[PDB]
Structure 1
């Protein structure tokens, strides 16, 4: 079973933790990768009801199981905060334009 389902993509908690750890490390070191400069602040324009505190940062989580290193980011993202807490997993899949919807 999937802990997070982003469209057709199936993710386990371990996938989210592995992705979050990579993005958090880059955040703490003040570095970014990719043309879109990940990780970067997530403003929560969508108004998701995150239970943890801000600031929030988005980082790509890949369907292949591989850790993002600068290529195409795909549609899915893990959102984490300043205290290394997972806020949520979201996706562009099933959403209009560049909006996000939450993964189930």
Structure 2
């Protein structure tokens, strides 16, 4: 069973934690990875009703289970804040253009 489902992608809590930790570290260190420079601010144009407070940061979560290190970031992301709290898991999959939808 999946803790989070993004399109056809199945994620467990552990996957999420592993990814969040990686992105948060980078965020702490003032460093980024990839041509799109992750992690980076997440504005929330979508208007999701997160339980955690802003500001938000986006970091890719891979279907492979590997931690993001460059190249295609795929369509899934984990969204975290300054306190390292999980805001949510979102995806471009099944979303119009470059918008996002929440994973279920």
TM (normalized to structure 1)? Answer: 0.99
Per-residue deviation, 1:71: 1.2
What 5-or-longer segments of structure 1 have no aligned partner? Answer: none
Deviation string for 1:25-48 (max 9, x for gaps)?
000000001000000000000000
Q: Partners in 2 of 1:17 and 1:49 — Cα distance?
A: 21
Deviation string for 1:1-36 (max 9, x for gaps)?
100000000000100000000000000000001000
Per-residue deviation, 1:92: 0.2
SS at match of 1:47: coil
Deviation string for 1:32-91 (max 9, x for gaps)?
010000000000000000000011000000000000001110000000000000000000
TM (normalized to structure 2)? Answer: 0.99
Q: May I ask how many residue pairs the two structures share in their alignment? A: 104
Q: Partners in 1 of 2:10 and 2:44 — Cα distance?
A: 23
Asked if residue 61 in structure 1 is aligned to residue 61 in structure 2, the reply is yes
SS at match of 1:62: coil
1:1-104 equivalences under 5 Å are 1-104=1-104
Q: Partners in 1 of 2:50 and 2:34 — Cα distance?
A: 26
SS at match of 1:87: strand
